[PDB]
Write a protein that binds this DNA or RNA. Structure first.
Ligand SMILES: [Zn+2]
Ligand SMILES: [Zn+2]
Lengths: 99, 1335
DNA sequence: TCATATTATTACGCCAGACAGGG
DNA sequence: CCCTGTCTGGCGTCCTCTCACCTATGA
RNA sequence: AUGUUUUUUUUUUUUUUUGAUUUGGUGAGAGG
């Protein structure tokens, strides 16, 4: 099985799972620890922001690849803003501070 | 873009500021059409239009007026994702307190209003009343009231009196709670009391009272008044395949809260009576509490069928919340997965990758390449071209592959060598071809395994895959110094068959002018691959400074050793191939090649090793047959001699001469002896079976048996497995844990019958159950370790210290187990090591000890090295580059940046699978004696007896290093003395552990002081001997009239005056303990070394209990202060022990549980770190008593003992840094001139920078005290709540952070993996240097 | 079809952490 | 009042693949 | 040398760009 780009889920902006659903590989927790074990800071940054979740990042990246410019414009993951709204939907005021 | 994440409470004004419209109706959707509800949960005006830039109902179907809201639609006009960020709010009719601040353990409202949880819930569920500023009545403010208590009060205090209930009353209490006022009171209460329990109970209440005043969190924000609703997009309502909507659980929760709130508003309209609106508000309280955190209240609500439905807190917490399932691990585009296979033609920087996966993973690069050439125009055309797969896109694909690495990943990645980057080579096929040597890194066999491929998209990621994660760059395991590209199984058989010899072959003893014609004689058919031969080889030894000097000579060698010499690079000597080359020898061949010639010859030489091993293993034809497993001819007579022996033992058992346990022990002993004899018979019969003549009489050699080369080469097989295929397969054990007395005398070449196979299945089912349940604890151990580490980044170059732990070789009592060169390899010395002669600067004080320095250490026989350890590093927030050590997979020091906490945690937890889950001293060598911790005396006979319990007996050799060590008890008969030379095997120690010696220092006469027969001691004349002994009783058997009497022996002179201790003016009286029996009676003159009484008496969960720092059930008790010791009160729960120091203050004591067999007498002076009883010892006692270096030596020795018992090589840096992360918190003792509190627990770097910026001023600092937290308590007690929330319980940590108003200055690895940016360790450390500089 | 709103099983194994009881 | 059983909560491995099954009521 | 010398309705509207190809929990079983 292989996936470059196709459909994703509803709640989250990450790719679907499985083969019958044309989906990508779950880059799990211990693989993130293995990339932290190296100096792979940029590989991990595209591994969890551009390739997976951030919608503006992935559309800009697809257009940047097909122009011939391997460069990522990262932004913030969508599932973290989902986390902010689920935490904030309690009586909890979680924010994002100064520039 | 943004610094720290701030968490605080949500005010009702803040919740109305989040909101965009009140969600009234609970009606979800229409359900018969497609439209929602106006205005229900899924509204239009409150949130937004379903369709993008459209009024859902009807107006604006173009792009001109985005925003207009007509009365017929009551709809906003924006994007489809606008509803995902917009949230609604439910105006709760009746106030409802939060469940996270009422049941968090400890509750936030429980230790703030000074009221028990039980009483808080009673009033909260409309079952109890609470008073609130009554007035001039006889009632308190916190005191509650019941129906009867209120009824009577109602008729009594009908006027000025307030007694409400529920959240409303609670809210008022919190609202009317002067925070500041309580502070002073609490502070004054803590300074006006001495109660230990109260002190801790008051310090925990004042801590959460002053923390609330420090932030902008109000006391009335605990109760929920304006409940917030999560965005619809985040609670999606999609239908499955069919005609119904599979609705989420949160819609059930919100719809019930809104149904109940509408009912409660209608009842407060209608003026229903009291009990109706109490049940109505109570059902609303339980509905809100079920929405927020379901199931924390009594049994959780359920929709379909009996399974409870999932609430908001269950969208956060757990293994499947947002942290562990969508933020730490994500699903990933440009990724693939398939079954692996070998492909041995590869070079070790490249892997095979199928054409179909390659054309799917590289669709955008192919699109960009196709658009560059000009073959097509629009993007559609290119997608049709690769959907059709024409003849021109495969050249495009070979031009996008070429220099573009991919990340191969095996699915259980345990350490960092399980993600490696290759270059693709395209494969006709559907299976990833993976280079074989690399398999030993992935733990990948080829029995059905699968791997995932990931594509580095951007340019920095291609460079990170080539420069950090390439497979040529990972040739040493980061856990140690051992190479991980060791040749595994076929190739060592090909080498072991190639470089060997036989006593006659084709071309025996002919002479050859080079290795080239050695291979030419092997190929043409004129010699054999193993035929001993003088060749002329030219080995290049590089003895100058970087210059290779040729020396050519004639080596008496074989043909195969010359053929393998054609592949060895220049610098290695010929003697690396002159031996037989098993697996350990080829591993040290690649290791010496890496240490001498560097990286590139070692990569190309690893490939040439693998190619020549595969080729000559193919030419070998090394099969396995049924005749290869040679049965010993002596096996049947050994079994019959064992059968005669068990027959003799059972004939004694019929006549009852021996006991049953001694029978079972004798049967297990003779079957162990017969098993060892059968193994030696088959091992001789395999290791030297070949006996071939050469030009005359016969001559023997090691065998070319196939199973023996598979065992001796170390390819696959050991002694035990080849033992079970030929000799008997031992004594298998039943699942009771005890062994079975009748062994399995049949191997596998003979047939096992039925019972023997069933006993075998006992033994093997236990092993499969152990692995399949062991793996969960191994993985959870790696998780706890990488979440306690998680932060620690090499961030300096020198901390500027002179402290470091004292690396000695470790010695258990056998031969010296782990040499000093294994422990001080590549670790930077603390002070400069003196050469063992006299005062020489052998090595300087900041040199890395690589192999050349360690060889000059081994030549001089250096005792022990004071070396720098990670736990002694002075760097605030990180570890400096010298106190870590060598890079371990790079030859140099650790770079500024490389995350060492994560590689250390992986290197400790990765061998978690291989670990298991469930008289006197006899010297061995011949050397010199030395004693430490010794205070001794010469007895009458001459044997130096010892008056100290804790004496260490070292055996030092003639060179200076310490070769043996032992522990000698109080009062043992030493055959030798101090500084003496002995012989190998001579007994040097003797004692009796069943009889605790009460030996003396001086001589004289014996008097019975406080020894009265009848109450103190008893008369027990011996039965079978007649020589009686006055038996000393204990303090429990005698009655209360004489229980105060302490029996003792004090030595006098010939007159009767007390003979004093030499050095003091005190007599030497020995107080006899309980259960003693007097050996030497009254009037008998004594000497030293003679007793005065007879006193009769682990694998992987050990690693968990060392890092998590549990206490053992019966710890060894110690002394918190030095000085004289005494006893106390007679058995009220415990038996007291009072320690009065010589110069220090007296009042320390401890109540010992009296079930322990003590070690100390009444006239004994103790010390800190000195034992009082025996058994295991808790690490907190080591930390608060001996020192920090003592507890780090304790953990690294007690866990390298597990990792060495199971045989795993791990360097000690990793355990020292997880020990650093254990003892990172501290507690204050004297607050000093700072802003801390008395017994406040604060982290160590904070208090050290505080009193280091105050001590640089005039003010003297604050004196701390370090504390050792276990790894899950230490990773949950962090100054970064996302780090402590991605890990275990999120409810406790988020309420603690919310009511404290905590802020997360990100500054670690997992905060930046959550929030989606660069890691502040690796390549991103320059980015975080830049961002930290530009503030 | 369109609002009404929650009851008659037990059978893990530590391991911390808080709580009423009593010498 | 300091030990103490006793009770309550909170953990318990990653990755993947196949299949089936989904609230009752109701004038 | 010369041409108002057989006229009659045998009739004028495009594509337009502006947007995408759509699948959530529970429980059971297998591979490594
Ligand atoms: Zn409209
Ligand atoms: Zn340091």
């Amino acid at each position: 099985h292989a996936r470059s780009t196709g459909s994703y889920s509803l709640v989250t902006q990450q790719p679907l799972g499985g083969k019958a659903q044309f989906g990508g590989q779950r880059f799990g927790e211990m693989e993130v620890w293995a990339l932290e074990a190296y100096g792979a800071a940029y590989t991990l940054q595209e591994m969890l922001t551009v390739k997976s979740d951030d919608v503006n990042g992935r559309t800009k990246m697809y257009k940047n690849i097909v122009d011939g410019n391997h460069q990522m414009e990262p932004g913030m993951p969508e599932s973290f803003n989902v986390l902010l709204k689920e935490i904030r939907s309690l009586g909890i005021n979680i924010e994002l501070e100064d520039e | 873009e943004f610094d720290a994440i701030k968490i605080a409470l949500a005010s009702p004004d803040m919740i109305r500021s989040w909101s965009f419209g009140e969600v009234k109706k609970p009606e979800t959707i229409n359900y018969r059409t497609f439209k929602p509800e106006r205005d229900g949960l899924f509204c239009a005006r409150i949130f937004g239009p379903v369709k993008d830039y459209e009024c859902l109902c009807g107006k604006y179907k173009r792009l001109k007026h985005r925003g207009v809201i007509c009365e017929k639609c009551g709809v906003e006009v924006t994007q489809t994702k606008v509803r995902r960020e917009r949230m609604g709010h439910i105006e709760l009719a009746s106030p409802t307190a939060h469940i996270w601040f009422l049941k968090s353990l400890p509750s936030r409202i429980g230790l703030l209003l000074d009221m028990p949880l039980r009483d808080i819930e009673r009033v909260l569920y409309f079952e109890s009343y609470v008073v609130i500023e009554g007035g001039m009545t006889n009632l308190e403010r916190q005191q509650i009231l019941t129906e009867e208590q209120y009824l009577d009060a109602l008729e009594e205090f009908g006027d000025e009196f307030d007694a409400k209930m529920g959240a409303e009353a609670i809210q008022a209490l919190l609202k009317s709670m002067d925070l500041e006022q309580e502070c002073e009171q609490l502070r004054e209460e803590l300074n006006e009391t001495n109660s230990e329990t109260k002190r801790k109970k008051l310090t925990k209440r004042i801590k959460l009272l002053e923390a609330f005043v420090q932030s902008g969190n109000k006391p009335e924000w605990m109760i929920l008044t304006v409940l917030p609703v999560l965005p619809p997009d985040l609670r999606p309502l999609v239908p499955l395949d069919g005609g119904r909507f599979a609705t989420s659980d949160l819609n059930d929760l919100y719809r019930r809260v809104i149904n109940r709130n509408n009912r409660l508003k209608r009842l407060l309209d209608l003026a229903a009576p009291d009990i109706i609106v109490r049940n109505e508000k109570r059902m609303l309280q339980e509905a809100v509490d079920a929405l927020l955190d379901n199931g924390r209240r009594g049994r959780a609500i359920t929709g379909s069928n009996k399974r409870p439905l999932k609430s908001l807190a269950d969208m956060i917490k757990g293994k499947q919340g947002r942290f562990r399932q969508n933020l730490l691990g994500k699903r990933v585009d440009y990724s693939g997965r398939s079954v692996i296979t070998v492909g041995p033609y590869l070079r070790l920087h490249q892997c095979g990758l199928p054409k179909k996966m390659a054309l799917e993973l590289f669709k955008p690069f192919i699109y960009g390449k196709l658009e560059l050439r000009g073959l097509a125009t629009t993007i559609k055309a290119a997608k049709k071209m690769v959907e059709r797969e024409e003849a021109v896109v495969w050249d495009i694909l070979d031009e996008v592959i070429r220099e573009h690495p991919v990340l191969l990943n095996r699915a259980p990645t345990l350490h960092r060598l399980g993600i490696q980057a290759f270059e693709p080579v395209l494969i006709e096929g559907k299976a990833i071809q993976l280079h074989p040597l690399v398999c030993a890194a992935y733990n990948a066999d080829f029995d059905g395994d699968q791997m995932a491929v990931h594509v580095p998209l951007t340019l920095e990621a291609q460079l990170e895959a080539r420069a950090l994660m390439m497979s040529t760059n990972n040739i040493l395991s980061p856990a140690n110094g051992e190479p991980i590209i060791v040749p595994s199984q076929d190739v060592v058989l090909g080498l072991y068959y190639m470089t060997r010899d036989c006593v006659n072959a084709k071309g025996e003893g002919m002479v050859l002018t080079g290795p080239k014609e050695a291979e030419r004689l092997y190929r043409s058919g004129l010699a054999s691959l193993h035929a001993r031969v003088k060749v002329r080889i030219t080995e290049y030894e590089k003895d100058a400074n970087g210059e290779l000097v040729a020396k050519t000579s004639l080596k008496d060698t074989t043909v195969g050793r010359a053929i393998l010499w054609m592949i060895v690079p220049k610098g290695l000597p010929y003697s690396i191939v002159n031996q037989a080359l098993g697996k350990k020898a080829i591993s040290k061949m690649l290791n010496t090649c890496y240490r001498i010639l560097g990286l590139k010859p070692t990569v190309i030489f690893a490939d040439q090793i693998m190619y020549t091993g595969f080729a000559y293993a193919a030419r070998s034809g090394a099969s396995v047959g049924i005749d290869d497993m040679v049965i010993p001819e002596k096996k049947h007579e050994i079994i019959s001699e064992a059968e005669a022996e068990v027959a003799e033992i059972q004939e004694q058992f019929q006549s009852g001469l021996v006991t049953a346990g001694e029978r079972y022990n004798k049967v297990i002993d003779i079957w162990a002896a017969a098993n060892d004899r059968v193994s030696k018979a088959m091992m001789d019969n395999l290791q030297t079976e070949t006996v071939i003549n050469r030009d005359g009489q016969e001559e023997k050699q090691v065998s070319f048996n196939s199973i023996y080369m598979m065992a001796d080469s170390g390819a696959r097989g050991s002694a035990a497995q080849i033992r079970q295929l030929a000799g008997m397969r031992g004594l298998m054990a039943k699942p009771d844990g005890s062994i079975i007395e009748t062994p399995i005398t049949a191997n596998f070449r003979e047939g096992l019958n039925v019972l023997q196979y069933f006993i075998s299945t006992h033994g093997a089912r236990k092993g499969l159950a152990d692995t399949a349940l062991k793996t969960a604890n191994s993985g959870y151990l790696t998780r706890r370790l990488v979440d306690v580490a998680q932060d620690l980044v090499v961030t300096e170059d020198d901390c500027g210290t002179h402290e470091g732990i004292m690396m000695t070789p470790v010695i258990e009592g056998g031969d010296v187990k782990e040499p000093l060169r294994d422990r001080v390899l590549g670790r930077v010395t603390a002070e400069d090591v003196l050469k063992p002669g006299t005062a020489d600067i052998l090595v300087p004080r900041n040199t890395l000890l690589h192999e050349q320095w360690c060889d000059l250490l081994e030549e001089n026989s250096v005792d022990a090295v004071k070396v720098r350890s990670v736990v002694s590093c002075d760097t605030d927030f990180g570890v400096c580059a010298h106190c870590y050590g060598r890079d371990l997979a790079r030859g140099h020091i650790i770079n500024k940046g490389e995350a060492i906490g994560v590689i250390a945690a992986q290197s400790i937890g990765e061998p978690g699978t291989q670990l298991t889950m469930r008289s006197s001293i006899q010297v061995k060598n011949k050397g010199s004696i030395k004693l430490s911790n010794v205070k001794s005396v010469v007895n009458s006979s001459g044997k130096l007896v010892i008056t100290s319990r804790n004496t260490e007996l070292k055996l030092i050799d003639e060179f200076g290093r310490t070769k043996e060590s032992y522990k000698v008890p109080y009062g043992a008969v030493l055959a030798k003395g101090d500084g003496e030379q002995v012989a190998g095997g001579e007994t040097v120690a003797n004692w009796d552990p069943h009889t605790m010696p009460v030996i003396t220092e001086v001589s004289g006469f014996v008097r019975f002081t406080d020894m009265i027969d009848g109450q103190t001691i008893t008369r027990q004349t011996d039965e079978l001997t007649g020589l009686s002994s006055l038996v000393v009783l204990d303090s429990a058997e005698r009655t209360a009239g004489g229980k105060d009497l302490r029996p003792a022996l004090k030595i006098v002179d010939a007159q009767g005056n007390d003979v004093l201790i030499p050095g003091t003016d005190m007599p030497a009286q020995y107080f006899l303990p309980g259960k003693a029996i007097v050996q030497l009676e009254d009037g008998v003159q004594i000497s030293s070394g003679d007793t005065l009484a007879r006193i009769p008496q682990g694998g992987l969960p050990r690693v968990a209990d060392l890092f998590e720092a549990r206490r053992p059930k019966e710890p060894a008790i110690l002394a918190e202060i030095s000085g004289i010791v005494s006893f106390g009160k007679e058995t009220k729960g415990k038996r007291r022990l009072v320690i009065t120091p010589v110069d220090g203050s007296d009042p320390y004591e401890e109540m010992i549980p009296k079930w322990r067999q003590l070690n100390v007498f009444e006239g004994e002076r103790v010390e800190r770190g000195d034992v009082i009883s025996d058994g295991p010892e808790a690490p907190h006692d080591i930390l608060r008593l001996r020192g920090v270096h003592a507890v780090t030596r304790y953990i690294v020795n007690e866990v390298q003992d597990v990792y060495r018992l199971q045989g795993v090589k791990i360097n000690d840096k990793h355990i020292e840094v997880i020990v650093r992360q254990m003892l990172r918190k501290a507690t204050i003792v004297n607050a000093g001139s700072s802003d801390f509190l008395e017994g406040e627990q604060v982290e160590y770097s904070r208090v050290k920078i505080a009193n280091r910026e105050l001590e640089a001023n005039g003010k003297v600092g604050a004196t701390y005290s370090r504390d050792l937290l276990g790894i899950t308590k230490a990773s949950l007690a962090t100054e970064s709540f996302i780090s402590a929330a991605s890990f275990q319980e999120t409810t406790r940590v988020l309420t603690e952070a919310a009511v404290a108003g905590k802020r997360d200055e990100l500054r670690g690895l997992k905060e930046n993996v959550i929030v989606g940016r660069l890691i502040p360790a690796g390549t991103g450390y320059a980015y975080h240097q830049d961002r930290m500089r530009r503030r």
